[PDB]
Amino acid sequence: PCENQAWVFATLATTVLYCLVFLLSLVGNSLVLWVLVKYESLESLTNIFILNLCLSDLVFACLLPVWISPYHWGWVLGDFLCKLLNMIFSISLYSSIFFLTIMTIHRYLSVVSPLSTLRVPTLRCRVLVTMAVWVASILSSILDTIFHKVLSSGCDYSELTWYLTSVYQHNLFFLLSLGIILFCYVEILRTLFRSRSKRRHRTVKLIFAIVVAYFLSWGPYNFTLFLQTLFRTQIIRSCEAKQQLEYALLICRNLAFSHCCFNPVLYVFVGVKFRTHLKHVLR
């Protein structure tokens, strides 16, 4: 058999970076919510998408510290509370990814065909699309509540089949989101390149930074999860490789959960409008 010598280091790494991420996400998302509520108007699709993504990230960060406890003294919260918390976790994660993808699609629509975005849509459709994204997240998250129990291994899936299904669903959602993001941003960059523009270097930089950050956050974590879901099925019997796979999983999971604090910087305050509004607020 194998022992996770990484457990001692994993406990400390979780209990430090989780707390740091929780504090940073709390402060950043609260600041973004204050800036958006005080000044902006809730009738433009950009504001709705930003507010909803920030709320999802805030809920994720608020739920984050709970999962620190099982590393120290195990899970003793209860069967039903475990299902509720593990449902909130998936709701927040999938809602964040979906709203990022929809916001990128909206940016491509605005840049490529400005006239279509110029005509403001009705208020009815915006609530419809928001509820559509939320209900999609609910449908993607509802399996965990009824398909995940409390066992000797703290909170963990009852059957291996649902574990495989969840991991593969995560992988497929990441791949589709990355494809949509890359297509939209490449189209925006090509459109900007076609006609002469002023200060296009800033936009080129920020598109490249956004794509690089998204890939670095969500690629290695899913690749390591795919390696783990191959080892768990017991197709490879290398006990030594598990030792490195555990450390890789630790690092990649922390990188992926860094998104709830990284997103507001790259999507809200790097722009000049929200930054100037925050400067006005600081007084």
Binding site: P1, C2, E3, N4, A6, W7, A10, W67, P70, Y71, W75, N86, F89, S90, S153, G154, C155, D156, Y157, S166, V167, H170, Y221, L225, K242, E246, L249, L250, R253, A256, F257
Partner: peptide, 11 residues
């Protein structure tokens, strides 16, 4: 999916 905890030992 990553909310589960690492196994201290495994086979």
């Amino acid at each position: 999916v990553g909310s589960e905890v690492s196994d201290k030992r495994t086979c």
